[PDB]
Design a protein around this nucleic acid. Sequence first.
RNA 1: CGCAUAAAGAUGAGACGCGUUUUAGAGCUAGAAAUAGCAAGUUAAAAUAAGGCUAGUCCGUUAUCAACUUGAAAAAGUGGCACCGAGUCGGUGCUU
DNA 2: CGTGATTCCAGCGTCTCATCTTTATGCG
DNA 3: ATTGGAATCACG
Length: 1337
Amino acid sequence: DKKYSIGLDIGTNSVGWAVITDEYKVPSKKFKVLGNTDRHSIKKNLIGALLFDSGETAEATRLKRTARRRYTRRKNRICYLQEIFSNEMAKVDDSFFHRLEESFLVEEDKKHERHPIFGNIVDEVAYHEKYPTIYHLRKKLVDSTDKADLRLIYLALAHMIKFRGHFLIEGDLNPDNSDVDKLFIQLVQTYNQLFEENPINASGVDAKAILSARLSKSRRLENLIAQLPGEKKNGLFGNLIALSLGLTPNFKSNFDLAEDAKLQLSKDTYDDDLDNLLAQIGDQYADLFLAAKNLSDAILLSDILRVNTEITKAPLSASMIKRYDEHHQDLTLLKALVRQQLPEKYKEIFFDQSKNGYAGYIDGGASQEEFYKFIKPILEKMDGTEELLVKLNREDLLRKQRTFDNGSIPHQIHLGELHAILRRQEDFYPFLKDNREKIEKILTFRIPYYVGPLARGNSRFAWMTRKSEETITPWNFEEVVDKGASAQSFIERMTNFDKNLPNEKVLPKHSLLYEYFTVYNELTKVKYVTEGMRKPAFLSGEQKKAIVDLLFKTNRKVTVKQLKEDYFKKIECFDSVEISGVEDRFNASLGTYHDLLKIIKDKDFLDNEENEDILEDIVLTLTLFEDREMIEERLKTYAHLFDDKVMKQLKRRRYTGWGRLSRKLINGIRDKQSGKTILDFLKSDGFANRNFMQLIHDDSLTFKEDIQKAQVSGQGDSLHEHIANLAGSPAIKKGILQTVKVVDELVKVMGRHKPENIVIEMAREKNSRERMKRIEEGIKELGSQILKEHPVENTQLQNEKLYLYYLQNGRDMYVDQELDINRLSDYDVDHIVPQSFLKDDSIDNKVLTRSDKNRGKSDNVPSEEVVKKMKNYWRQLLNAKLITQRKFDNLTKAERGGLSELDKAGFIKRQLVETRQITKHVAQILDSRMNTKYDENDKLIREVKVITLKSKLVSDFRKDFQFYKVREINNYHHAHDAYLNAVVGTALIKKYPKLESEFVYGDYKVYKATAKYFFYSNIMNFFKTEITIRKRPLIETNGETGEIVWDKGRDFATVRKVLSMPQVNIVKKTEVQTGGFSKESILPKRNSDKLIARKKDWDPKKYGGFDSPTVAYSVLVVAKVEKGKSKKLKSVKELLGITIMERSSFEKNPIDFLEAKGYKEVKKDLIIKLPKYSLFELENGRKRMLASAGELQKGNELALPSKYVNFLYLASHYEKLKGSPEDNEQKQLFVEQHKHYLDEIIEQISEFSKRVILADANLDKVLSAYNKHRDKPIREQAENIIHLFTLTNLGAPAAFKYFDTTIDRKRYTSTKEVLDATLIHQSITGLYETRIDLSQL
RNA sequence: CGCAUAAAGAUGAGACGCGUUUUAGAGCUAGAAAUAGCAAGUUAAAAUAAGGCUAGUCCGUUAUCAACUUGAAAAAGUGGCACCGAGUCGGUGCUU
DNA sequence: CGTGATTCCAGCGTCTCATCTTTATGCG
DNA sequence: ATTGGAATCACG
Ligand SMILES: [K+]
Ligand SMILES: [K+]
Ligand SMILES: [Mg+2]
């Protein structure tokens, strides 16, 4: 019956827990030990931590799943093509497709001739001589007119269909037009022929280079406008240019059309949009648009083709043949030049696959860039290589046809080549003539993103509904698949249900019912005052309806002045109006009402009550579907009500956005007695004018009970389901679930007595590629040449100062100057918001400057003068996305007011008050689980108070009272943080019950700038003996009550004693490994049993395969095996290591599995399943965690005494020095007086390593390295001993560096010993254990 | 408390481009062979987690997971306390 | 000739679309 | 980045 509290520290890979009592002491208990060993009891402290691998997101699984679907559907494309061809192919060659299928198999496994295409050596050689690449064949079939072998036609069509290109361009691309300059001049011609007053003159402008520039589209537009004399990017010609290049231009202001009429060429809606714009102005400008379309084509077609198109209808295949021919010519030239000038390197270039020369480029793993890096010095160190070098710097030297950059080829080009082949060969082959659209559809068919997987009820990811029960081929897809239903289910399966009625789906945000609801909700709060009024009074239902009919239904926004004049003055005849409860501009407005009024031009239809469900369906359809065709399909039912043009205008309108209130919630549920819905009450409440909340918070009204009935239905969810529904990372969700489980186990351990308080705190927690892409886009948009000055590696951009330099165009952000790339370690990285106000260290808040003093004052936002200097530069960076909206607002906050003392107070408070929503959700879960009893009046009984702390409170407590944390010693700090949290948190609610509303979970009613500033600055000052000097009492009092919240004479002793306890329950969560079967790399054939066949029949020794399988869990099996020629049965105990691929086969029948592996007469009761991280104790406390069936991890924690931890913190100058010069001097002197600690610390590590780690060579290496550097400053030795602690850590062995020396991993690559050790099964807290003596088996 | 914007993250769908693996693309000459010299090289088929049954243009890498007992499962149930101490927890007393 | 030390190695780039939450910053 | 799988190397 002893009161206690729980403190928790939740992280992504750790959950620290601690149980404390009223005196801040951690209890200890004797726990029963189950199993077959002699040990029966163990004393353990109720402080510990759970360690687990981070929870992964589903994104990688999603990408693998989508890739699997794409491979299945590509094989289906080829299958459809072969089905079309099969009847005629069986005549031409019956075994052709069989050879294609078996082409992977080796000679002895092939059932037909080893040559796939023609089945004889002569014809195969002749084919490969005539068409060196498939593109030769494609060009021949597109251009030639004599009948081709059916096998060749199939091969070309299959190549086009299999690798078809992207669908990022909608409509048609005609490759007949490729000249940029000619089409640009034609556009200018049409513009001048239609516009004579201000003609466009652009002669003498390199249209080809500017428009096809490698820079960004926006910068290309800027460059073209720059060379356009007397033109504007927002002008009509500028809009045409933006449309052509790809940027979406607004054509409203060009013609003053009063509608946006945005025209994006790539989008399919453009056509319809274009027609709309033709209705806005006329057909005279249509020619310009036509030219713009053609111009756009050339812009995107000159990028990939770069070949003449008047002589061929296969510009892509001809471009690839040009690649082939230039590669051949350059290869011959390079061979000759190398054999003439550097004859010794030829073998390196053209024979050595390991090297990145031509042989490595073709036969080895060298990419194009690696080959260019290898060959550029050789080209430079030779004569006659000017053309080769020019090609190389243009990235056009010795190219391959199948390259990384073929991702810019639209499927329209492949479709054009396929269509040309079909037209050429259709007369010779009738089935090609009558299956032409079939094959074109095979190439171009693509399941819409809103239909998803074409499942038949066996997929958890599928939502499509089928009109008819038939197989969905690409040809009957539009007939078998219900696309409207599929798209609606696509949107609605991801959208929310309203919380009040969890089975009901939310309304569209722009629903007329929702707008009416919000308008009435705000209007019921309108408190008008006019002359002759004794007291302020609310408006009545009739007045509200009159105002809605007058103000809202005729004005988009309704203000106070319009309310006073057009209603109170015009009708009420009251010239003195003062409003209360609202602002000048009403937030709620009938935007949907006015938009529908403009679209349909009818008022009776809108105001009619009985047809409003039609409007609800209208807005729902306009919200659900973005495609004009589907909107048309759904609205066709309402075509009779409106006109055809009105139907088109409706089709154009789209209402993005959903709400949070369902239809039933607003106007579906009715009160038992009144029979009025919530909307009805909002319309006519009476004198009360209650809002929606008061309407659902009234006990007399049945709405509260109806909501409760809806909420109870479904009984919430299981803990795992409720946690998964949270908005957070899967890693933090794993942390939260483990936190709840440890709390349940701790409550069990404490005799089912629930804690008095649960104080919880959560941590706030490739990249180089993201930085590279961001800087590339920013520089391209800006138009700078900085990146061309210096090619920076991705890992080199990981430097903070370098990244800031590159993001700022190399220029100081506060003044107008330039920084030097080589003057690093000299400039200053400053924070836009000072670290005192906000502890933010991300790039979004950091600025690189030559000297920080240029910012102005260091106690506020940077000065107004700096803003006036660099606002244009900041805006240019923001438009290039080198700085964000947040960064720009922070930088320019001075001109908008700067930082008032109120903002400083708020930032000070938020450094201690945890406002994160995820922490509130965790607190709610814990409170709901702990507090369940209800009052007689149906009110929660807060038996357990859930407090939420921030990491700053505990961190500052650690720093102030020398409770220093070094994260490298061991994992105990996790546990320690949890303890400290409770120790702080409970203390706070002892000292400040009035502050519960900021810390304890629950809506407590307990609630100038300098006052709050100093209050929260010194809110934790009751712990320290001497303030500022002020000497608060030794024993702090509760305040207005008599309790000992803190006893400075003995409570600090208790905290220091707790942090020095050697036994802390650190548990690594044992997990069965799931995921990929093995390494994905397909290795070449070799005679090794570690190769895994990629198919049943693909024997690895002849076809290669996978290796490195991941072990799901090991299996301790005691059985017999055959030994010797006589195959005598030897008894063996062994770890098998069931891999992920073998797991299902093993669990289906373990005995059959083990007999297949070779073990005989296994004991199914003696088989032990051992997941990863299974704990074993061997001797002297040496603990090994099973990492796999053949590898062990360290499983021991080093309990370094607290004095060494504090000395290493001070000596390392953790986070530099943040103390007063007097205290810093005292601590530095303490370090100097305590140099000998270093030796002692080393001894600690050494003795620990001699008992547990057992890495003899690494320990000797470490000792020698330490002896080498004994003359270094104490600080550097301290930092490097912090590094040294990696030798003794728990978990996987790692490599560490002591100064210069690097000590590599000593790995325990043998699990033989653990077969005769003590396996330990630990509960989540580790308090409950079962020890199995495996040597007894 | 309500709107607008931006960023980040989560989830799902539809698609591209490569990469890899085996086979095909008769390598030739001098050679007894070792090999040497020369020539050639750019392409394609197929697989792209083994595979499964539910046979779909589906599904197969997320989440969840100590032990023991009751179980389809979800899951439920199983382990005295106090005190003195502390090198990973030990001991003493009370109790059962 | 086993066995500990050592070395090496690991699928990756892009685009379109939708929904949700959370945080930051204005406005109100 | 990490950390287990695999091959290879050095050597008593
Ligand atoms: K797992
Ligand atoms: K466990
Ligand atoms: Mg497959």
